[PDB]
Design a binder for this molecule. Structure first.
Ligand SMILES: Nc1nc2c(ncn2[C@@H]2O[C@H](COP(=O)(O)OP(=O)(O)NP(=O)(O)O)[C@@H](O)[C@H]2O)c(=O)[nH]1
Ligand SMILES: C[C@@H](Nc1nc(Nc2ccc(F)c(Cl)c2)nc2c(C3=CCNCC3)cccc12)C1CC1
Ligand SMILES: [Mg+2]
Ligand code: NA
Lengths: 469, 167, 166
């Protein structure tokens, strides 16, 4: 038979499942909704582990339970009463013999020890992967240290001592590869001559590599805490989502820099060379699976100042038109081809973050926080699972590092890129559009001629890499 | 067969803009949504007895990618310009959204509707007369919608389709 | 994209977590933090086909020994890990092999025998002894180092191939 349980009056997590406290989706069960007590019971269930659920719960729980209350509840879960001696044990003791304690030993082995270990696994995951709760609430951290530091008894000792050390390390807080990274490539600008760095003087291969390292680092820095609760859209977004916003502002700045490079090149022949070079950088972004970089270029070519430049577009070589068209088509039909490509490539990659943001926001906005059933309000956990499926996909692509060497001067050049200067956005984008009208006026105005601005060769070195001994 | 209309929702973030398309495309009567579901932004409807397919682009949440607005707007034939009736800044943003649409479409007469969205019970700060006056100065319809009761949602999209049909 | 459920099992301290984190993050973990149960995901192209690996990293400490049936039921293939400088961990392999076969009620479960810590000179389990055991199970034997990455992709991706052809 099943093990008997403590009375639900002394241990709340022994209440029977019912539709008034838990609802399952239609081989472990998947929870659609439940009370917080039932969610925590199943988070730490005696029959099976559910590591995905631990991640989902710890990522999303603050929309229905405060961190201080979660700790109180899992401590309550941990403190399981042991059953009293049975009739057979009683009779043995009355005769001066040692009882077999069969039911007690089974309850310890099959209920208490698994539940307690799974509570500690929640604590371990909480500290290792969601430590911001403790950074933001020093008293919560004190409570966790005290709880872990006072767990007695030998069955849990190895993990209690380990978790104590993990907490202490987190308070005060290296890559190996299958091969060597390729050699850094140089064109007109030579190493150390940062004052000459520009779109056409750096090597297009190395522009794409160094932007990919920068954009990969920005992608990898975004934590789920910046996404849950749609906080990057709210009034405190600069406080709650700083790494995400830094990532987006880089993408915006690079798109605007590409546009500025194009329209400030007034001579048609030179402007064709600029556009061709940007499409070569796009080709290397594609080769590196840097889809953020691909879309930086695609957004620039779709912008009002650039898209209208028919005389420039006409002179783009056919093979480069085909590269740009293929990249543009990734975005068509609500990013259908992009989504299929992301799911087919071999990482490392840099995803485009915008689709994730829209899907998290719409999942939050389009589903209710609670479900009402039999007069009770149950937490709608299916909604949180859907959000955590998206944050889990994000995290999966944050693991793989690029085997590319940083060039510190090229990195600093792109870190400090500031195409808008001190201008406000409307000011600056109006300037770009008026430049576009100057260099290629609306028909039937005649096309003017403009002097060259570049004194160095415009011929591209191409984007196939070189390899000396 | 049937005509497909490519519609684009634009407007300030953080003030419930996404509720407009969610409530439309939703199972009207079950309050649930998976936006990742291929063609959860397509809906077949009958407007004035003529069946058509709506394809709605709402990039809610991507507002900080400001240099992508041209790309997204370029996909559309008609536009819903949305502000929140309790956020005056979102209302003041409308002029620049409309100017940007006109530039992207290279036309002074782009089918569009102005939508005032009631996203919560916080106090209204944009009166309907102010929004009607703005819409009239542009020559476009004004529709008010609730982000919670679905009121006005069908009217906003069907009015825009009528603007496209009568362009 | 096919999904594959891999489970990493073996005695405490043999390097199950270090192997998994080397595969996932290209990082070697120096600390010895005993695992309760962890799970990782990895998209990777293997023999020209994209798949999604779900990797369950399990507890080797004996105090968790009564909690294994639940993860053995879900797993589609098993990395059976011992350390080549720890003869007791090698003797523990057969207990994992027998429990997996019982739980899954099958003589034909995808498995790979992994001898980890092969960067260390002071070996106490000879390759021949491990290879003999692997042949008796019908499975390959791969020596690995979570520290240097030697053999790590080979071990995990060989297991994928055995699930794929199961
Ligand atoms: N030299 C060397 N040390 C290794 C290697 N793999 C793991 N270690 C070290 O061995 C120790 C235990 O590693 P760990 O991955 O935690 O082992 P585990 O099998 O996951 N232990 P548990 O079963 O308790 O979760 C750590 O100090 C780790 O750095 C290896 O290939 N070489
Ligand atoms: C592949 C590319 N497609 C198109 N691009 C561009 N232009 C353009 C693109 C890149 C440039 F570097 C410059 Cl300079 C220009 N115009 C187009 C037009 C026209 C617009 C306005 N007049 C009529 C003709 C029509 C159909 C497609 C395009 C897409 C990324 C955007
Ligand atoms: Mg481990
Ligand atoms: Na206001």
């Amino acid at each position: 038979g099943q093990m008997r349980l403590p009375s639900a009056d002394v241990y709340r997590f022994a209440e029977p499942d019912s539709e008034e406290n838990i609802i399952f989706e239609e081989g472990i069960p998947i929870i659609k909704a439940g009370t917080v007590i039932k969610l925590i019971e199943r988070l730490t269930y005696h029959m099976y582990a559910d590591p995905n659920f631990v991640r989902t719960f710890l990522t999303t729980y603050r929309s229905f339970c405060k961190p201080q209350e979660l700790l109180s509840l899992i401590i309550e879960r941990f403190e399981i009463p042991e059953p009293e001696p049975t009739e057979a044990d009683r009779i043995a003791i009355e005769n001066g013999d040692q009882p077999l304690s069969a039911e007690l030993k089974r309850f310890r082995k099959e209920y208490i020890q698994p539940v307690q270990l799974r509570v500690l696994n929640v604590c371990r995951h909480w500290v290792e992967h969601h430590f911001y709760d403790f950074e933001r609430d020093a008293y919560l951290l004190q409570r966790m240290e005290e709880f872990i530091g006072t767990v007695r008894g030998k069955a849990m000792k190895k993990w209690v001592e380990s978790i104590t050390k993990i907490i202490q390390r987190k308070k005060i807080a290296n890559i190996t590869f299958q091969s060597s990274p390729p050699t850094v490539e140089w064109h007109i600008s030579r190493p150390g001559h940062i004052e000459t760095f520009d779109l056409l003087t750096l090597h297009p291969i190395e522009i794409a590599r160094q932007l990919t390292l920068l954009e990969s680092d920005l992608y990898r820095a975004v934590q789920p805490s910046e996404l849950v609760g749609s906080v990057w859209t709210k009034e405190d977004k600069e406080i709650n989502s700083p790494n995400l916003l830094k990532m987006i502002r880089h993408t915006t700045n690079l798109t605007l820099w590409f546009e500025k490079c194009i329209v400030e090149t007034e001579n048609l022949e030179e402007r064709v060379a600029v556009v061709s070079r940007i499409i070569e950088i796009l080709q290397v972004f594609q080769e590196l699976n840097n889809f953020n970089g691909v879309l930086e270029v695609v957004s620039a070519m779709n912008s009002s100042p650039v898209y209208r430049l028919d005389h420039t577009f006409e002179q783009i070589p056919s093979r480069q038109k085909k590269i740009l068209e293929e990249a543009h088509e990734l975005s068509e039909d609500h990013y259908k081809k992009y989504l299929a490509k992301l799911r087919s490539i071999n990482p490392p990659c840099v995803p485009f973050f915008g689709i994730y943001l829209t899907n998290i926001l719409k999942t939050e906005e389009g589903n209710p926080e609670v479900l009402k059933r039999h007069g009770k309000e149950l937490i709608n956990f299916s909604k949180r699972r859907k959000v955590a499926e998206i944050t889990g996909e994000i995290q999966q692509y944050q693991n793989q590092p690029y085997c590319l060497r940083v060039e510190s001067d090229i990195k600093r050049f792109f870190e400090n890129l500031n195409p808008m200067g001190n201008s406000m956005e409307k000011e600056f984008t109006d300037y770009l559009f008026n430049k576009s009208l100057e260099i290629e006026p609306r028909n039937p105005k005649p096309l003017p001629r403009f002097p060259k601005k570049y004194s160095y060769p415009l011929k591209s070195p191409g984007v196939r890499p070189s390899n000396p001994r | 067969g049937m005509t497909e209309y490519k519609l684009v929702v634009v407007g300030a973030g953080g003030v419930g803009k996404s509720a407009l398309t969610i409530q439309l495309i939703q199972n009207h009567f079950v309050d649930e949504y998976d936006p990742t579901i291929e063609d959860s932004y397509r809906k077949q409807v009958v407007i004035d007895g003529e069946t058509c397919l709506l394809d709605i682009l709402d990039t809610a949440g991507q507002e900080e990618y400001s240099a992508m607005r041209d790309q997204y707007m370029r996909t559309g034939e008609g536009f819903l310009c949305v502000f929140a009736i309790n956020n005056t800044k979102s209302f003041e943003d409308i002029h620049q959204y409309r100017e940007q649409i006109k530039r992207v479409k290279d036309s002074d007469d782009v089918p569009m509707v102005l939508v005032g969205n009631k996203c919560d019970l916080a106090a209204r700060t944009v009166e309907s007369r102010q929004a009607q006056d703005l819409a009239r100065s542009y020559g476009i319809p004004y529709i008010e919608t609730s982000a919670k009761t679905r009121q006005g949602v069908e009217d906003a999209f069907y009015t825009l389709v009528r603007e496209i049909r009568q362009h």
